[PDB]
Design brief:
Protein name (chains A, C): Tubulin beta chain
Largest sheet of chain B: 6 strands, parallel
InterPro entries (chains A, C): Beta-tubulin_BS, Beta_tubulin, Tub_FtsZ_C, Tubulin, Tubulin/FtsZ-like_C, Tubulin/FtsZ_2-layer-sand-dom, Tubulin/FtsZ_GTPase_sf, Tubulin_C
Pfam families (chains A, C): Tubulin, Tubulin_C
Largest interface: A-B, 43 and 40 residues
Order of helices and strands of chain B: EHEEEHEHHEHEHEHHHHEHEHEEHHH
Strand content of chain A: 15-25%
CATH class of the largest domain in chain A: Alpha Beta
Strand order of the largest sheet of chain B: 5-4-1-6-7-8
Radius of gyration of chain B: 21 Å
Number of domains of chain A: 3
Bound molecules: guanosine-5'-triphosphate, 5'-guanosine-diphosphate-monothiophosphate, magnesium ion
Order of helices and strands of chain A: EHEEEHEHHEHEHEHHHEHEHEEHHH
Shape of chain A: globular
Helix content of chain A: 40-55%
Number of strands of chain A: 12
GO molecular function, one term (chains A, C): structural constituent of cytoskeleton
Structural class of chain A: alpha/beta
CATH superfamily of the largest domain in chain A: Tubulin/FtsZ, GTPase domain
Number of strands of chain B: 12
CATH architecture of the largest domain in chain A: 3-Layer(aba) Sandwich
Distance between the termini of chain A: 43 Å
Strand order of the largest sheet of chain A: 5-4-1-6-7-8-9-12-10-11
CATH topology of the largest domain in chain A: Rossmann fold
Subcellular location (chains A, C): Cytoplasm, Cytoskeleton
Oligomer: part of a larger assembly
Chain lengths: ~425, ~425, ~425, ~425
């Protein structure tokens, strides 16, 4: 029961999922052929959430992959695990984005979305009781943004009750991939604040820091960067695919982490992180996981929580561990950091305990954190946004696809109202 | 299944393209006979038998240099309908390139092109290689680029025009062709790339250690630039780049769309050692004012936008390390309204060596496609050269008697000066 | 018992049957020699319906093949299964059609039909209890149309009680084989609405769509196109040649699908359709057959049922399957598509369940659908018809064979009255 | 068991037929001696011994070019009763072809024909190859086609007449023969096909890359057209076509029955590569106005009906793909009353190469047999050429003194102008 339909969008939206479906396949023991060659019995007990059973003891993922060019889709089917997906599900266009939010959401996104909504609606009906959708995309590019937000506008209309969460990638502070990413961010964020129930803001600036400082890798490729994002994604729904002594799910993480239906931008965290030479000397016990999470450098967002305040904190642990050893740590981080949490919400720590660990590591955890630290993130976008808009630079490319200036005002003014809302609860009594 | 044809106009078109299509046939195991012992679907339409042909068009008004192709090494490689010739040349006239000789064969050129787009399905955009100096590169291109916006329009058109030198001008009346060909291509070509000859002579002397280059040595380093842009089509990379993205990240306003290219590293075979060629080493060689290929000191002006392409074994982390250095240097400054002026491109495959070349088999290479306000200083001298020759009404009578009204100069001067003040608006910073 | 006499007419009428008799031979296990080399016992239990037993353990088809030239008949006997037919049955003329309905039905059709009605009447008497006739022809050409409709006018007079159904081929919307096919259609349809009990309108425009989109074939030949039409034809009488848990036949499909004796133009459908690379990942179970049928693109007619309304729906399944899993799907497609079915007929879904599957595939189905969607089909003929008739173009060729203009009026006015009848039941209360 | 004889009249008849019967003997393994080491029952009546003969008739009023056959390579191939000769020629006179020399040997020509239809049983129709220019091709054909409607009538008769050129007229009095021979053949010949010489000279120069063709090179490309029509008889195809179908799909009204032919692709051996020769590629070459074989731009007029024949390895799906493109092009338009103007023909066998020819061994070929209203523009000039010569009463006295009333011109002019207004009715669209 409680099935999930996975959607991808963009070149960044593809390569994360290819790393992500690589991890989920090993968490159950699924070969690169597509059959089953596992060992235990709990691997198959909840297999139906991310898979539909086919005949001949072969299993297929319930995946939907969308891009505006046949290039990135060719790379997925040609690498490892390029045979596991059903070849019908690969939707790909021929026009291409052009790295343009106007072309992604109005001109070419509207023509291809009808070929997507057939495959979306077919996979929703074949499941018994649908739990909700999750989307992996980015905000910088065109196909990840414009084709991405168009689906979320059409998903919520045909399915209002179903939960909807996004593993987007917010662009970094220092380096910047796309010149028109402030226009791409502001137009996409205005859609994310209407049809998404939560958002997992991940920054590549944090990922180059973690793979260099903590993993101690000389030349970290994207396969090492996108490996950690998948471990966070798997760690959210790890209590749904396995039994546990306190079972959480997407809906329990929805209500417990969102106090107000606008404030739904979250930052993740993962633990443990042992390097190659440093793996044997570190004593890997339960309190050692606790002091690794709550610092600044282990967050996957490029903002220190010391500037702001926490609202809600989710903790999803994995492994045979005792509750008292967990509850002692979760109580203790409230007490000495009593300034950093907010006052008018008592007990702002949500605990979730699974049973089965991931592969190799004896135990694990997954951090979800809400904070007012993200107001520096959107203001750094909002300062860069009006700095380009005051000169009307790069404006006619969006305008030439039939887009009015009032769209930019209604996008940007709705952002600063949200920034004021985080400014309100930061200094409330 | 995405394709991109290329047009080569005149003697500037063909001799650059000869080394270019030489380089493409080496990077796909392509014999010159067309045999070979997917990936290469971009620039080649496969025949039924075991033979490949390029998606190329070579056009010239004078049949001299075309016959090098029909007799040389690359002879059985092209469809002979694609080698359109002529009888008489424009002979450094814009009028003969656009009015007299142009209006008699332009229908045959357009007709072969529309056959090419039908057998393609992933038609992205166009490539036109010519010069501002010669009459064929100025006149015949100006008539051609008008027809494309009539015919296709929405397809992104690129040009590697040979911008004339400040001092080493081979032709005499280059201040007459370069102004009039700009007054046509400004409205139709959304993006064009400038490469000067003179700086390449400075690069070939100072870094290649070759005191005597012919046009061949110039044609090699331009051919690396062409392959470095279309590399994301011919190979899969970690972070791709498309030909529609270049007009997005490099056109801040629809008038000013003239960036300039710089290739790095440029080293010889016996100097291929003695340095480690790291990504941080070569990226400082990109923004160095001596190593550019257009004679415009960028410290005079301001960088509006930059687009870097990396190819080979390129660390994704160290690219983030390299750009973090350059945003801190005081000598390089950006324009006030643009905070984030970079476009990063990563592809796995290295640029190979051409046999008998001079560059060595490096593991990594950069093609810098950046746009600056420093190029406007070159325009002011070229417009000042235009006012000198027009004041005495010299060389005008060759242009009047070939289907051109004399008042067209006074109109085309005003739009050029209108472009001249457009750089002056971008140069100042913000108010308050 | 319940034997069937098969008749062919035209070049299109020949090549379908050669593909059709290829399929029926493998459904029982009959060699290209003509003997029996089957394995099981139910293959021979109902063999007498499409065959007459000859001595020496050899079997002959009960076929009648008609064309106006010796060309197409030479191609049938020279290919594979060119020896199975009795050489006496091949009736062929020497004049030729000329692609003319006037020559097909009056001049040369009347001379050859006397040589046909001997062989027709001989094969009718040798069977114990005749069930009815089926005809495969086309409407575009001359021999398929004029020689085709002349038989149906003479069959019904000598045998009124016997059922009479046609696997015709209605010409496509976009491409058009015959310039005078609007004259060929209108004159043939006027005979089909008097002497035929039902009609299976198949369009080649649908067949090029199915073999390209669903089968994923680069160069589909007619042997691949005519293979699917035969699978529909075999799927209609599949409950007559095999026992089943709910036995339908031609007469049960006659009464259940025809509410009014004029409205007898039907569209077929087939399922499943797995491509070569897509055959293993698709889970082939009973509800997967249901959602494949009722869309637009799997119909073999070139008209969307969304424009009109269904009247009756026949479902003929093949294979060891459970009824509850069938009845759940047949109920469910009524409920969510309650607009698309008509109101004043309750329970407009006819179910038929055979036992034995076809070769290779584990289970199968066959769709027969009645709709008001075909009013776009005849009006597209009727608009093209009067557009040629107003200028009297191509008229003297029909006129020169002794044909009056009043024949065209009585043909065309009887068509538009039928179009008004489908217009009536579309918007009834 | 279906057969079709062919008549060849005059020097235009024989020299075209020489390359044609050359081509038929190669596509059935037929040695010129008649020996060979079913399918070929159409154009050959088999003898008792191992020897085959054609169902052919060669007739000419002047015995010059007939003696090429009785001395050349194809010598033992024909029955010498079938090579009917004459003594004196018509010499570009319609009167000597129809009245003087015609009435003395026409009984011998009819008598050999009626022997041919008796040994046949599948007699479909007739083929008559001649020209409008010469007197034998005009006069002797006009007397012959009248006798066939008297004798057979219901058998469909086809003609590949050589329609005279707009400019390259070899003979002088071609405006006199072409009018009078049209006034006879209009009532009897139900369908006739026009092929002009001048456009073939344009095809042989532009696409075959042969600057100097003789009549041989013209006779090859006409011979492909003849074999492409009768291919459905000589071989089984997926979708057959019969010689009675051509008068059905191409005669909208019993006066206007003049379509025109175009063969495609037309490429050389060294240009046989460098293009893939897909069905969509060659079908655009069919409706191209440059590639036709009759000097009439079809964009001036309107296509009434079209009949396409494909032969070789032809995809049935892609033919549906090709026609769906051409019905969308704005430059090609059809007549308002006809929505569905196509007739598709598919056969399995390719057209072979003649040894020492110029076309290469392709895998597919198209013969376009389309009918247009653009041909009426050629008639208006040819009728205007007729009014000029008749106004001065020039060249009339050669015609009066050979059994022809002078008033026959004034009658035959009126029926021609009656045909001229028949195109004008079809040209306008519908009312309301
Ligand atoms: N980069 C490069 N520039 C070249 C080359 N050959 C000539 N040029 C440039 O071409 C310009 C002279 O114009 P041409 O291209 O020769 O003239 P054209 O366009 O062929 O037309 P005509 O005047 O009719 O010959 C100068 O700016 C030269 O620097 C070459 O091989 N490479
Ligand atoms: N296509 C083609 N046309 C030819 C050929 N030879 C002659 N013609 C054409 O034939 C016409 C002249 O007619 P002829 O055939 O020579 O005259 P004729 O019908 O034999 O009549 P007489 O001169 O009285 O014998 C001109 O239009 C020539 O272009 C040939 O080999 N091929
Ligand atoms: N985490 C992560 N981010 C990536 C990766 N590759 C690119 N990105 C980021 O994603 C964005 C580029 O996404 P991309 O999918 O290519 O845009 P698109 O418009 O959807 O695709 P395209 O048309 O422009 S090629 C940039 O912000 C870039 O930094 C990757 O492998 N991992
Ligand atoms: N499904 C199908 N339709 C075909 C096939 N071949 C032809 N057709 C269609 O059938 C019609 C042609 O039928 P045809 O039998 O040749 O006419 P006829 O008059 O009976 O025979 P003919 O004298 O003209 S050769 C056209 O509508 C054509 O599109 C085939 O193999 N399969
Ligand atoms: Mg030149
Ligand atoms: Mg002669």
């Amino acid at each position: 029961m409680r099935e999930i339909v996975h959607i991808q969008a963009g070149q960044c939206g593809n390569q994360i999922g290819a790393k992500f479906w690589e991890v989920i396949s090993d968490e159950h023991g699924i070969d690169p052929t597509g059959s089953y060659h596992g060992d235990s019995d709990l691997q198959l007990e909840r297999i139906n959430v991310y898979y539909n059973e086919a005949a001949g003891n072969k299993y297929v993922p319930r995946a939907i992959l969308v891009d505006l060019e046949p290039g990135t889709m060719d790379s997925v089917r040609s690498g490892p695990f390029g045979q596991i997906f059903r070849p019908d599900n690969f939707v790909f266009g021929q026009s291409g984005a052009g790295n343009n939010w106007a072309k992604g959401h109005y001109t070419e996104g509207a023509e291809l979305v009808d070929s997507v909504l057939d495959v979306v609606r077919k996979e929703s009906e074949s499941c018994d009781c649908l739990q909700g959708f999750q989307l992996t995309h980015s905000l910088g590019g065109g196909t990840g943004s414009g084709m991405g937000t168009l689906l979320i506008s059409k998903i919520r209309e045909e399915y209002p009750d179903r939960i909807m969460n996004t593993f987007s990638v917010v662009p970094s502070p220092k380096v910047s991939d796309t010149v028109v990413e402030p226009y791409n961010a502001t137009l996409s964020v205005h859609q994310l604040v209407e049809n998404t129930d939560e958002t997992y803001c991940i920054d590549n600036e944090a990922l180059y820091d973690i793979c260099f400082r903590t993993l101690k890798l000389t030349t970290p490729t994207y396969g090492d960067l996108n490996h950690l994002v998948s471990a966070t994604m798997s760690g959210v729904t790890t209590c749904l695919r396995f039994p546990g002594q306190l079972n959480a799910d997407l809906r329990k993480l929805a209500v417990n982490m969102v106090p107000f239906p606008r404030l739904h931008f979250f930052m993740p965290g993962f633990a443990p992180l042992t390097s190659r030479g440093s793996q044997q000397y570190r004593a890997l016990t339960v309190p050692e996981l606790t002091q690794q999470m709550f610092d600044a450098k282990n967050m996957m967002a490029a903002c220190d929580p010391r500037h702001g305040r926490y609202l809600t904190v989710a903790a999803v642990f994995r492994g045979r561990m005792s509750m008292k050893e967990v509850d002692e740590q979760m109580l203790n981080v409230q007490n000495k950091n009593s300034s950093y949490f907010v006052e008018w919400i008592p007990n702002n720590v949500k605990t979730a305990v699974c049973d089965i660990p991931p592969r190799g590591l004896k135990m694990s955890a997954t951090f979800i954190g809400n904070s007012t630290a993200i107001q520096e993130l959107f203001k750094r976008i909002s300062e860069q946004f009006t700095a380009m808009f005051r000169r009307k630079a790069f404006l006619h490319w969006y305008t030439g696809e039939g887009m009015d200036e009032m769209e930019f005002t209604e996008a940007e003014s709705n952002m600063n109202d949200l920034v004021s809302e985080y400014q309100q609860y930061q200094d409330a009594t | 299944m995405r394709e991109c044809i290329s047009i080569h106009v005149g003697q500037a078109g063909v001799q650059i393209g000869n080394a270019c299509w030489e380089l493409y046939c080496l990077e796909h195991g392509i014999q010159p006979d067309g045999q070979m012992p997917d990936s290469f679907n971009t620039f080649f339409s496969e025949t039924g038998a075991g033979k490949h042909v390029p998606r190329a068009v070579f056009v010239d008004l004078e049949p001299t240099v075309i016959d090098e192709v029909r007799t040389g090494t690359y002879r059985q490689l092209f469809h002979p309908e694609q080698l359109i010739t002529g009888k008489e040349d424009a002979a450094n006239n814009y009028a003969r390139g656009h009015y007299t000789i142009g209006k008699e064969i332009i229908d045959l050129v357009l007709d072969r092109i529309r056959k090419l787009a039908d057998q393609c399905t992933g038609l992205q955009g166009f490539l036109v290689f010519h010069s501002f100096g010669g009459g064929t590169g100025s006149g015949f291109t100006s008539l051609l680029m008008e027809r494309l916006s009539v015919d296709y329009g929405k397809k992104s058109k690129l040009e590697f025009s040979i911008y004339p030198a400040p001092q080493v001008s081979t032709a005499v009346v280059e201040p007459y062709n370069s102004i009039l060909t700009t007054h046509t291509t400004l409205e139709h070509s959304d993006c064009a790339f400038m490469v000067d000859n003179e700086a390449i002579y400075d690069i070939c002397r100072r870094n290649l250690d070759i005191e005597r280059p012919t046009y061949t040595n110039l044609n090699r380093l331009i051919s690396q630039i062409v392959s470095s842009i279309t590399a994301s089509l011919r190979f899969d990379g970690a972070l791709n780049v498309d030909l529609t993205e270049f007009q997005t990240n490099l056109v801040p306003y629809p008038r000013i769309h003239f960036p300039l290219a710089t290739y790095a590293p440029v080293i010889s075979a016996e100097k291929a050692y003695h340095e480690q060629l790291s990504v941080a080493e070569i990226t400082n060689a990109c923004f160095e004012p001596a190593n550019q290929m257009v004679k415009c000191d960028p410290r005079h002006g301001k960088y509006m936008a930059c687009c870097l392409l990396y190819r080979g074994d390129v660390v994704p982390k160290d690219v983030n390390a390299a750009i973090a250095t350059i945003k801190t240097k005081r000598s390089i400054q950006f324009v006030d309204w643009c905070p984030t002026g970079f476009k990063v491109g990563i592809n796995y495959q290295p640029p190979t060596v051409v046999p008998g070349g001079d560059l060595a088999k490096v593991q990594r290479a950069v093609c810098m496609l950046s746009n600056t306000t420093a190029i406007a200083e070159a325009w002011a001298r070229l417009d000042h050269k235009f006012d000198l020759m027009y004041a005495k009404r010299a060389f005008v009578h060759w242009y009047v008697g070939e289907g051109m009204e004399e008042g067209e100069f006074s109109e085309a001067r005003e739009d050029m000066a209108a472009l001249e003040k457009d750089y002056e608006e971008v140069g100042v910073d913000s108010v308050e």
